[PDB]
């Protein structure tokens, strides 16, 4: 018996599946395993998975975010290094989108294997306020500056904003970071050294946020509108605002609260290219997918790397798939006729699989005791309590 430690939302089902199909296997009964998929309820899966991890019958195999998500594990050795299992292996090489499984690492080390969806984060925009004011799509930075004059000019508010979570304040930082100074200036920063927050590309980053908040970008009442309770994606569906960067889960959202809306007048784009930057302007941000890892005191290892050969398997795609999920697999380049929504996940998967990096989230990416502290000064910053020089040196400061 191999314990499974996973997030017990609605999406647990795809992970029962696979117990099932895999408990069913010969390649299971070969490896004398069976694994038994412990949810936990969402809102306790961070504590519980601690007080597990520090104690005897801490789980074989967990659901993670990679990154910060797993920091003190790797730091307390109770992690098996995957790097070289993923690159003998004849599935797990070949068997995911190589960006996704790099975005959760630590170290240039692989600790994760790809298991749930990919989400990431898109320009989403309101076609039918697009439609009266002769907008299109922004492609590049002095584009969408354009689309932000006139959208003003014709009393709109460029972009809906959730300020109360602060984390969909942050992604607007986390592309213009990348898009300006490249994938290497947060990978440094997110592998614990602080001083990489001093790297100009975050200062710019910075000013270029305090500049559209400066000019009305977000409109003046943006820190009380919440993404969780549906304020800033009902802006966009009530054409109040024309655009909204947000994780891929807002087609969802709009689905679920404004379904004619979704249908019809959302639509998506890239983040646009930033002139003069060094990113590689394919690069995408956002949620590279859940991962499991897996536990180094694990009795069997061998059963444990059978069982995560199946998250590369034509059967766990499917399952992803008619889940309503983007999979990170490699054969689902040509499954995804049968998602719910082809369209939305075609362009998702084909943005994914052509980008040199997939950064994973800024605030599942750092050491968790960065991450209260970190949006608490991105807050400040778009609130204005702090100029960007104030909150690069704030960031230079974390321990």
């Known amino acids: 018996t191999i314990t499974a430690m996973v997030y017990g939302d609605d999406a647990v089902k795809v992970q029962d599946k696979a117990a099932s199909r895999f408990n069913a296997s010969a390649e299971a009964k070969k490896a004398n395993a069976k694994v038994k998929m412990e949810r936990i309820p969402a809102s306790d899966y961070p504590a519980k998975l601690r007080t597990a991890m520090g104690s005897p019958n801490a789980p074989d195999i967990f659901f993670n975010w990679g990154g910060g998500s797993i920091k003190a594990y790797k730091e307390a050795g109770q992690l098996v290094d995957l790097t070289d299992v993923i690159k003998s292996d004849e599935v797990l090489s070949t068997g995911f989108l190589p960006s996704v499984v790099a975005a959760g690492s630590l170290d240039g080390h692989e600790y994760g294997i790809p298991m749930r969806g990919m989400q990431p984060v898109l320009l989403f925009y309101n076609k039918s306020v697009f439609a009266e004011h002769k907008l299109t799509p ?4 002095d584009q969408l500056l354009d689309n932000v004059a006139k959208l003003k000019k014709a009393g709109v508010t460029p972009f809906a904003l959730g300020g109360v979570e602060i984390w969909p304040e942050l992604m607007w930082l986390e592309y213009l970071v ?11 920063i997110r592998n614990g050294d602080a001083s990489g927050w001093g790297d100009p590309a975050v ?26 309770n549906g304020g800033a994606p009902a802006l966009l569906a009530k054409g109040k605002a024309g655009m909204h960067l947000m994780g891929s889960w807002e087609y969802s959202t709009q689905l679920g609260k404004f379904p004619d809306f979704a249908k019809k007048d959302l639509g998506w784009c890239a983040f646009p290219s930033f002139e003069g930057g060094a990113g590689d302007i394919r690069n995408v941000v956002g949620n590279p997918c859940n991962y499991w890892s897996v536990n180094a005191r694990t009795g069997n290892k061998d059963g444990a790397i059978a069982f995560l050969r199946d998250c590369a398997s034509e059967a ?28 939305f996940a075609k362009f998702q998967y084909q943005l994914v699989q052509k980008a040199p990096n997939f950064t994973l989230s800024w605030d ?12 608490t000064e991105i807050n400040k910053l778009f609130v204005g309590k702090s100029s960007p020089e104030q909150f690069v040196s704030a960031l230079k400061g974390l321990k």
């Open 138 to 141: 922004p492609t590049t930075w």
């Open 178 to 188: 990348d898009r300006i100074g490249g994938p290497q200036v947060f990978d440094k």
């Open 203 to 228: 200062l710019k980053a910075a000013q270029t946020v305090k500049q559209l908040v400066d000019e009305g970008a977000f409109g003046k009442g943006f820190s009380s509108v919440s993404y969780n």
């Open 316 to 343: 766990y795609t499917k399952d992803l798939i008619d889940n309503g999920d983007v999979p990170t697999t490699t054969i689902a380049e040509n499954m995804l006729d049968s998602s719910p929504n082809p369209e």
């Open 364 to 375: 599942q990416a750092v050491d968790p005791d960065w991450q209260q502290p970190m949006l």
